[PDB]
Design a protein around this ligand. Structure first.
Ligand code: UAJ
Length: 380
């Protein structure tokens, strides 16, 4: 499109937002530059009216997708650049799960040589004690709390593993030892842990042999597993999530096998064993959900009825208590001018944000670095 030649250089950016959230009114100004060739934008935002009544991360999506890098084979699907320089109107509803809602309207046009994004934001039905009005979101921290849930599952698993190990040693030093989990002649964790399936899952011998250092009491694997689940719960990166998922899968397989042993070989209803199986399914589901929550894509489809596009996506904001806050975005773009625009096939934008602070800025502010690439259409 013709508007493309407006984006091959470095473009200055002005962003102006006036907001009102549960009656707390505020203004934000941002300035910076966009480099669509690299899909890179760098902007600094100031709250001009004082302290921002909402967390900065929640405003990132509102505070210029024409700076996305569309690969050469997808240039015919770049609506945002084709609406320039006249621009487009971008409207959104952002629904925060179990809390309030943002409603936004923006005009994005060229004024002289400046790309200008002017926004009105109205937020309603927010909880004063919630994560938003309560300022409980993490800004950019790379480690933090694991969350009450993960903490309970992992600590419980760790204590039960510790006691299991203690039982195995005590029973090995005394046949008449009766454990806490020795409930009856048919419920004896002592008998379970001291069975050959109590070491290396009764499998490590047949593969790596009996001297292998992997031939540890199953509860040793328990200690390491729950410990790593708990520390990985403290990291805020993709790879920690995948590791949590893989370890959860291994624990799942081992738990299914050990349950089969419990009911069809040992004829034992080991209450502590069933409990660790349940905890392990819980962690399986949590790591599965975590991996799903890792996706940051903007899903774009053409809207012929408005000669523009529509998009929807989910943002997950980290909460200081270790939980996550969902923000369901629904988005509409319509051209301002009357010249031709590109209506794309289905695709998505992949975006990466880096939030930081300016050590020299005394006003409430956000430094933002962003890389955005279009994808979702295979080049073949
Ligand atoms: O030694 C064991 C055994 C022998 C026969 C039948 C069942 C089991 C176990 O549950 C197993 C455990 O003790 C052990 C376990 C049981 C109870 C509490 C903490 C740890 C365990 C290890 C790995 C997984 Cl993934 C699940 C459970």
């Amino acid at each position: 499109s013709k508007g493309e030649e407006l984006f091959t250089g470095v473009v200055p950016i002005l962003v102006e937002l006036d907001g009102d959230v549960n009656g707390h009114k505020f203004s934000v100004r941002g300035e910076g530059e966009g480099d669509a060739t690299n899909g890179k934008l760098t902007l600094k935002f100031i709250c001009t009216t004082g302290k921002l009544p909402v967390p900065w991360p929640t405003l990132v999506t509102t505070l210029v997708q024409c700076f996305s890098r569309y690969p050469d084979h997808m240039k015919r699907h770049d609506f945002f650049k084709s609406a320039m320089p006249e621009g487009y109107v971008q409207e959104r509803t952002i629904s925060f799960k179990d809390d309030g809602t943002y409603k936004t309207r923006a005009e994005v046009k060229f004024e002289g040589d400046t790309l200008v994004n002017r926004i009105e934001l109205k937020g309603i039905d927010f909880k004063e004690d919630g994560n938003i009005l309560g300022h409980k979101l993490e800004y950019n921290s790379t480690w933090g709390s694991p969350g009450w849930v993960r903490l309970a599952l992992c600590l419980t698993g760790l204590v039960l593993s510790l006691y299991a190990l203690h039982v195995k040693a005590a029973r090995a030093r005394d046949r008449d030892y009766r454990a806490l989990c020795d409930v009856g002649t048919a419920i004896s964790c002592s008998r379970v842990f001291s069975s050959r399936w109590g070491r290396g899952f009764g499998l490590v011998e047949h593969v790596l042999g009996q001297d292998s250092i992997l031939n540890q009491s199953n509860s040793i694997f328990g200690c390491i597993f729950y410990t790593l689940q708990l520390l990985l719960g403290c990291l805020r990166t993709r790879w920690a999530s995948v590791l949590m998922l893989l370890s959860s899968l291994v624990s799942l397989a081992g738990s299914v096998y050990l349950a089969w042993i419990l009911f069809f070989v040992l004829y034992d209803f080991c209450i502590v064993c069933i409990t660790t199986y349940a905890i392990n399914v819980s962690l399986m589901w949590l790591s599965f959900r975590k991996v799903q929550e890792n996706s940051h894509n903007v899903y774009i489809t053409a809207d012929k009825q408005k000669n523009g596009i529509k998009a929807n996506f989910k943002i997950r904001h980290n909460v200081e208590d270790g939980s996550v806050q969902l923000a369901d975005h629904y988005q509409q773009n319509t051209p301002i001018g009357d010249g031709p625009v590109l209506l794309p096939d289905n695709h998505y934008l992949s975006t990466q944000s880096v939030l930081s602070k300016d050590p020299n800025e005394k006003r409430d502010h956000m430094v933002l670095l962003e890389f955005v690439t279009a994808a979702g259409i295979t080049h073949h």
